[PDB]
Subunit: 419 residues, 4 copies
Amino acid sequence: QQQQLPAAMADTFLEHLCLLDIDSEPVAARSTSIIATIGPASRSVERLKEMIKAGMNIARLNFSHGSHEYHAESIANVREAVESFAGSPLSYRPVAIALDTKGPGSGGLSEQDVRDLRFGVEHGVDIVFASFVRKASDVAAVRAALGPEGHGIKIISKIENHEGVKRFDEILEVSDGIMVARGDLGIEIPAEKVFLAQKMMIGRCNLAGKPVVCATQMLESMITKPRPTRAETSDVANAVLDGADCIMLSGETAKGNFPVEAVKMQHAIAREAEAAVYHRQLFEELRRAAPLSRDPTEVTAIGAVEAAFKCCAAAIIVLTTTGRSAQLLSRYRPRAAVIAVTRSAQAARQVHLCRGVFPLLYREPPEAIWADDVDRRVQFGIESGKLRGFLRVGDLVIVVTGWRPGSGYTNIMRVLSIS
Amino acid sequence: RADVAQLTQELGTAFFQQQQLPAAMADTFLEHLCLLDIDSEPVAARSTSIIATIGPASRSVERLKEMIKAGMNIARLNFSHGSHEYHAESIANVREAVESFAGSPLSYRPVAIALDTKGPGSGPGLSEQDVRDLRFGVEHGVDIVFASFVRKASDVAAVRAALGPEGHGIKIISKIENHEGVKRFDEILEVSDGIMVARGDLGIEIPAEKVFLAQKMMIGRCNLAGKPVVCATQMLESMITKPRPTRAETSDVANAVLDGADCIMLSGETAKGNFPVEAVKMQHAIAREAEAAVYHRQLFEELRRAAPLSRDPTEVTAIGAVEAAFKCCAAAIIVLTTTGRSAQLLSRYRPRAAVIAVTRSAQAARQVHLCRGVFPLLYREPPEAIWADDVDRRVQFGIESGKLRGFLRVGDLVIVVTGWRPGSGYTNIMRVLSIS
Amino acid sequence: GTAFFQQQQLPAAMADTFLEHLCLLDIDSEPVAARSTSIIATIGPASRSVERLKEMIKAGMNIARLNFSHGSHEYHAESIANVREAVESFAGSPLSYRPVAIALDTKGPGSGGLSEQDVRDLRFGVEHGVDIVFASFVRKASDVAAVRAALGPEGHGIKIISKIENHEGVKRFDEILEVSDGIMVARGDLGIEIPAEKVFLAQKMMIGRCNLAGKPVVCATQMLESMITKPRPTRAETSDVANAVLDGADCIMLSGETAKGNFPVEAVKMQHAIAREAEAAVYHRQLFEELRRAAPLSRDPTEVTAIGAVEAAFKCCAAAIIVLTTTGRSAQLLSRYRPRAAVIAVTRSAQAARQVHLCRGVFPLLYREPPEAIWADDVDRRVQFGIESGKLRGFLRVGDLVIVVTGWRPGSGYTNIMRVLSIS
Amino acid sequence: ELGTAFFQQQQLPAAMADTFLEHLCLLDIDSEPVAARSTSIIATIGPASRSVERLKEMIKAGMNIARLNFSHGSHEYHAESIANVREAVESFAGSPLSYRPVAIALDTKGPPGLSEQDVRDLRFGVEHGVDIVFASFVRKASDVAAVRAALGPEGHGIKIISKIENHEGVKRFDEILEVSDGIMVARGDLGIEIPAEKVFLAQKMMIGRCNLAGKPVVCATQMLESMITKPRPTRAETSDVANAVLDGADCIMLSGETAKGNFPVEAVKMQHAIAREAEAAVYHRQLFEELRRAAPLSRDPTEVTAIGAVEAAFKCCAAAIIVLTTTGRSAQLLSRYRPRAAVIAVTRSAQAARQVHLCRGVFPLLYREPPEAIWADDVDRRVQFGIESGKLRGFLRVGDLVIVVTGWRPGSGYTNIMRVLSIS
Ligand SMILES: O=C(O)CCCCNS(=O)(=O)c1cc2c(c(O)c1O)C(=O)c1ccccc1C2=O
Ligand SMILES: O=C(O)CCCCNS(=O)(=O)c1cc2c(c(O)c1O)C(=O)c1ccccc1C2=O
Ligand SMILES: O=P(O)(O)OC[C@H]1O[C@](O)(COP(=O)(O)O)[C@@H](O)[C@@H]1O
Ligand SMILES: O=P(O)(O)OC[C@H]1O[C@](O)(COP(=O)(O)O)[C@@H](O)[C@@H]1O
Ligand SMILES: O=P(O)(O)OC[C@H]1O[C@](O)(COP(=O)(O)O)[C@@H](O)[C@@H]1O
Ligand SMILES: O=P(O)(O)OC[C@H]1O[C@](O)(COP(=O)(O)O)[C@@H](O)[C@@H]1O
Ligand SMILES: O=C([O-])C(=O)[O-]
Ligand SMILES: O=C([O-])C(=O)[O-]
Ligand SMILES: O=C([O-])C(=O)[O-]
Ligand SMILES: O=C([O-])C(=O)[O-]
Ligand SMILES: [K+]
Ligand SMILES: [K+]
Ligand SMILES: [K+]
Ligand SMILES: [K+]
Ligand SMILES: [Mg+2]
Ligand SMILES: [Mg+2]
Ligand SMILES: [Mg+2]
Ligand SMILES: [Mg+2]
């Protein structure tokens, strides 16, 4: 069998490793999102179209470099490249825009960060990667600088030093997610300890059900070379096996000679590594650790993921306003793709932070009866799923919906046979 | 602690001290045993059905009303004794006692009628007396047949043929009573609706010290197959003459439930003994304590690991509903069912939540007592013009009956299992509902 | 051979889940190992004859219980003399001699604190060299201290097994177990003191906690009750015996079945037959894993050697673990890990040989030879005595692997060596 | 006792976790490694690392195995490198605290069958007393047989580590491992022969299968590649080293990093620092459980003793397992169960002392005292030599517990004894 299914059926983690097969081809869509830093080498609309086709899901703009005018032009070019595919709604791929802050430097929230965060709100950025977060009050300051109009921007705290690692729990509690910012972390703490901080933070984020990004020097040699080193491919695969929701490219896409090839390489490795995940142990441990809950979205999500594993469901189609119902499905790490049908263009972009969530932006005419409108949003997930290769006639899918309109009312799971 | 901290704050520490919940949260079976607490009171409705043999001591309509209130779910008529006239009178008395509670549809308790055959004796196949008794069963509308001395698949085919075209809906529970039945167990279970571990004959046919191995193996295989299994004979034997059982008898009843038995049975204890109602009350009291002591964490994990992948939407919905019920400590899983099958597939995963099965079939309401944790509710209203409205009314009937009987309280979460179109075989929906 | 792997429920032993283990239990898979759960038989008019006691020893009785709720001191002194005469009638064949413990079961406090009758009975016990006290109605740690004080300076070596018979004993279980040598789940009184339908919860909890503590636990009362008057037990009775062994009980007991009934020998034979079947049905894969996980780290060399020896025995399907012991402690530490291999304990202490019957899977052998001049030769002779005893009794055959547990110097407390030996 | 500080070091809070997810969540950058680094470092000797003075610094930095790549250089060039390694190694014979055996490994050029150059280079290896051959491009069992035949009458004791470098070697892995002493995951060629994104699958599979077989596995190529020109590695490189150790690799390797790079000593220091951190982060609770479950039952006393000793070491947090070995086999069987305790292997064979560096966690001590007339005294002298070396090196202190593994008679193949000692 394909997608490492012989290794998936193993009774121990050791036997699972023994059964990994280089000839077992991945079939599932690539789950781990790729964040590519946009810079001189990846700014043109033509280059950005190739990066989107190669697998870029989130465009990062590093406000440690360039200027407001430079980054606004990169943002406009990203949006032009993304919207060039909107003419085919069944295959359109949303792409998030993330602003990475310069940071506090010596000393709270710097004056440059206040201005850059305001720029982010004015330019409709989806995510903020907040540099050098070392305590909960740093997150509150970033949130306050985003103001009343930036209530919906996701804050991903970058852990870059010893204090951030030690105060991790309080930082994660108030953040939307975390970035393991290994460049500074590898200079702030001994280089030989970074893997411990990475594995601990990824594990704690997986436990919390919040997105975690692995970043910096993942494919470093590809800045000048067309192929990566053996350590670099291993690093990408191990970040996925660790449980990372996203993987990142910095100089590799911002200034390197092979930006598209770096994205293609992360896509190819992530897909292989996702199939090599030992779901039998991972699901059991995530399910045991996820606390008991009376929230119906929480209850429906675990029921849906259990049902998907029982029938080898090709996908879990979920309707979501904010992305939350898709995020609660993603936290259980289903092998089934989570196809999230949303009308919110911002939620479609932001949900790339959660592993295995494939956002579909709904642009079909509304139905007069709310129940019919729900059914056509589900048929839209099915038709997009068929076109993209997620679904085929005869497949089983799990459909997750709610009892009334508006966010917070997901409570239904259905088993549906395709076509 | 972190996996139950928020729910402990919401439901309270008292909730998590009842129904052996501290033992339920243990990380190992050894720790689970260490945490069993005699002060942790059972809260859930008793899920293992009680089969009471009806005879001289339990025949009157007045006595039968007391036995139904004490917990009898299935009335057994042993065709090894009495006659057709005697058993028909017992059946009429059971039906009169059962129907005396029909005036209140929101509290009515269905009771199944089971015919236990005399058996083949020294003959190789279906005896002439069994052919006549099986025909009596069909004519008197019995729900279940406990077929004596089943030794191979062809024995069950002969019982099925003797029930004729009008008895296709009767459940056949094969009684394993000898070495051959144990050795050919897999082929017998494949063609039967369920099994009875008939320990009286089994304990004479094989060494007495080996019966527990056969009992535990057959219960385990039935649990794996998702088919009902009954533990029978001498469970509370001393209660035929004494008001209280022995220490070995209470232990035996508790261990049959912990083994995984769907039903427990009383023979002479209810048929001829001096304390028929007290014997039913004792099995009810022990079964509730034992059900709470089941280590669901390992049982659910092992039932998932051993059960193969399934493309049947009823099976897929059932596992998702049981998983959802455990996540929120659901008070109940309400399921709509025509034949009982959707309730049976929920029961095979052994949820702690009561499975409230709403059905229009009076026979399916009686037969689902064979499946552990299924509480049948007979819906008597005529169909609504719009099918979706009819479905909704049946779910609301389950909620209202649940509140009236004490299964459900305001603020509870319930899991509701329904299908996408009318008719049997289309269950595919699981909903999480808050009781208001 | 392939036949080896079909016996003693070995197909069920290899299962990956407890559910599949149950599914693989086979009534045709015959038990091979020696019966490891000890049988306690209460002595009375049905079992007091010296000749009848010889039959009970041959049937499998390991511990004779004297119930001091019935009979005078004169009655119990005669019981002790009769038991000792029957036991010593087999001493002429040292390779097959079976030690038998004598346990004094107290009348209890009644309406009162240690009663004055219990003080007198406990002093009688010390004067007559009883090995174990089954202390009735233990409700708290101070009840155990009072029993220990009544045994005096000469009774320090007597084991105290606290009987849990009421709600207070169950609630104060942890403090009682801490100061006791072991526990008895005294189901007769327990089933009247608490609701009858709750006794199984108290039994399973106390057995589980004693298994975790590595201390002996006895399941008692009405196990084969109908055999007081009938030749065969009920289906519930055989199930109760099998389930007490599967629960983890070190010992099972007979009261009226051996003291006053018409089938004392048959009741012992029935418990022996059931216990042997149930021991093979134990899912050692999960049990060993959980006993290891729950047991804390230890710096005591006897315990460290014991876990290593039990792990080694499982690795090679060892026929036995032969251990030399002065007090029984090295054998008890092996027993707490529940090896499938029989623990053959060789000792010179007649009292330790009798007391180790409290620990499941310990087969005591009383060595009577005076010490060799060279200590290493004395140890070897005792190990060879264990091997010769085991071959004669059917525990061992040529070609079997055994684990041998000894210490680095004479005297108690110095066990620290485990060795893999081929039987020649 | 041990103290609270003891339980905060070497990732012991993460070690006690009940799940792998909880284990990851408990990894702590402030929990310092205490145990000696157990993953051997292989350094390729070339232009940048040839001088006797540079080799002394590489030995102090942690190099355990010197690799001579016969794809380059010549017989004269590599003989001079080997003589320089031996001079640097023997310069530490004046201090037991710094003297460490260093293996010499010959890596072949590679291949219709065995190339003429490989026949001559393998002959050079035998003539120069090499310990190990890393055989390039092994694709099937007959490739190993050809290398084994070329090692001739004098070199049958040389270990053959088959390098898996292409699709065929991965597909025929089981047959290759069966006849090889171990494996090298040769990622350079493997990453060109198969898609680059699949190398991690082949690495993890081969390491897992070698761990199951109890045979050494090496992770190789581009582990710290950027350190050829830079003083510090990339974040991907440190992660790659840590993950090779967490995967289960017995050895990690440096090629161009030490052969031609500007920072050979720093590359060795970096691998030592990472390996030590990664070894403490291994989740032994699951690893030991799975190695035990997957390993078949065994009647070999060395195998039975090894699992018992590793279980005993975990029970007491033993500072070390001291094993007497002539071939290295008894130490290899301890290593296969991945104890946290260091395996201190005392041997009179200088070749076995160098070769046991292939097995994770084995610390070789070459013993050179003349044999005692009384064999038990010769065994005791070697056990005490292991203890006194352990004390001098920082492995052991007075009051520590150690597990000691020996056999019942002299000669290889008789290991059957495990003892718990207490350091005095
Ligand atoms: O901080 C350190 O020491 C670590 C290295 C950080 C850099 N990583 S990056 O992918 O964000 C990046 C971002 C940028 C550039 C990079 O070359 C680069 O590698 C530019 O040349 C550029 C030039 C004009 C305007 C904007 C940019 C720009 O945004
Ligand atoms: O693509 C390939 O097949 C080649 C990849 C490089 C191989 N790596 S190595 O660490 O074994 C190594 C080995 C050597 C050298 C290396 O520079 C080098 O990186 C030399 O300059 C040298 C020069 C004179 C005599 C001997 C050597 C020598 O032994
Ligand atoms: O994931 P979220 O943000 O809670 O959104 C889920 C919501 O989407 C729905 O499925 C559809 O709601 P809308 O019709 O308002 O889009 C609701 O029933 C449910 O509450
Ligand atoms: O358990 P069964 O026998 O499959 O019955 C379940 C059936 O009951 C329903 O929920 C309701 O069906 P009806 O309206 O025919 O009673 C169906 O949608 C479903 O297929
Ligand atoms: O189990 P215990 O009471 O600690 O006895 C074990 C003792 O028995 C021995 O094996 C033999 O000791 P003796 O020669 O004194 O009988 C000692 O080495 C060891 O300390
Ligand atoms: O690991 P190996 O090569 O089998 O060597 C183990 C041998 O070492 C010993 O412990 C000591 O033997 P020697 O005295 O011959 O060195 C033997 O008892 C044992 O058989
Ligand atoms: O800021 C970052 O991305 C880093 O330091 O790795
Ligand atoms: O038939 C029965 O019920 C039996 O034998 O137990
Ligand atoms: O004392 C006892 O043995 C009892 O009450 O069971
Ligand atoms: O030969 C090697 O070492 C390689 O290819 O990695
Ligand atoms: K930045
Ligand atoms: K009958
Ligand atoms: K008494
Ligand atoms: K080479
Ligand atoms: Mg940074
Ligand atoms: Mg019968
Ligand atoms: Mg009593
Ligand atoms: Mg190569």
